[PDB]
Design a protein around this ligand. Structure first.
Ligand SMILES: O=C1c2cc(cnc2NCc2ccc(O)cc2)S(=O)(=O)NC2=[SH]c3c(Cl)ccc(O)c3N2CCCCCN1[C@H]1CC[C@]2(CCCN2)CC1
Ligand SMILES: Nc1nc2c(ncn2[C@@H]2O[C@H](COP(=O)(O)OP(=O)(O)O)[C@@H](O)[C@H]2O)c(=O)[nH]1
Ligand SMILES: [Mg+2]
Length: 170
């Protein structure tokens, strides 16, 4: 009695895609993780009484054109779109990742969660209000996380599972 969920973590270089994924799977914070390493991680968790197998792809994709990135966006069921709260450019980049995914899916309606990572850093440049407004405009949840302190790390991934589960009924 198990359900699979294929999750893809996307976002600009250095926002904490790897740190978030490794904190969820391995319960440690990576200080200086090779920016080019792209790996999948599988873990069983219980969410809302369901035993879930999470298959998570940690992407490191800054290529403009990539057959393999199109393939993982076709295969992925839900997308964690991560920016860093101290990097305005990473926040502006979200629009481009969302557009790429909608194009591959040929759908305006795709399970996504907006994640503002590095909430432990004091010098914020992205107002929580702007991030909430962007998420509202996309019709998706918004969560602020810290891969360093584990704040809302499970919540971000488990919220994305909940989004996928609900879309499966629509
Ligand atoms: O070759 C790709 C790999 C496989 C694929 C896509 N991108 C991959 N790497 C990222 C990449 C590679 C080349 C490139 O030019 C651009 C991006 S795939 O579509 O054929 N397989 C997918 S899509 C996917 C989603 Cl959407 C969610 C969860 C998944 O597990 C998943 N998978 C299967 C695993 C992908 C693992 C990333 N890899 C390798 C696989 C082999 C290895 C070495 C040993 C075990 N892990 C290194 C990582
Ligand atoms: N302070 C803080 N640093 C973080 C956080 N997440 C990641 N980092 C750091 O930011 C850098 C980039 O993280 P990484 O996970 O490699 O980013 P990726 O390129 O998106 O995979 C590393 O130096 C991490 O230690 C966070 O929540 N808080
Ligand atoms: Mg990385």
């Amino acid at each position: 009695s198990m359900t699979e969920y294929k999750l893809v973590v996307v976002g600009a270089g250095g926002v904490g895609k790897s740190a978030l994924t490794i904190q969820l799977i391995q319960n440690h914070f990576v200080d200086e993780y090779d920016p080019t390493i792209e790996d999948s991680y599988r873990k069983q968790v219980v969410i809302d009484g369901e035993t879930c197998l999470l298959d998570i792809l940690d992407t490191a994709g800054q290529e403009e054109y990539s057959a393999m990135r199109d393939q993982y966006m076709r295969t992925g069921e839900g997308f964690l779109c991560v920016f860093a709260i101290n990097n305005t450019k990473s926040f502006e980049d979200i629009h481009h990742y969302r557009e790429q995914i909608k194009r591959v899916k040929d759908s305006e309606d795709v399970p996504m969660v907006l994640v503002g990572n590095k909430s432990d850093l004091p010098s914020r440049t992205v107002d929580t209000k702007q991030a909430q407004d962007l998420a509202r405009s996309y019709g998706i949840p918004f969560i602020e996380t810290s891969a360093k302190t584990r704040q809302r790390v499970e919540d971000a991934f488990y919220t994305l599972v909940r989004e996928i589960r609900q879309y499966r009924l629509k």
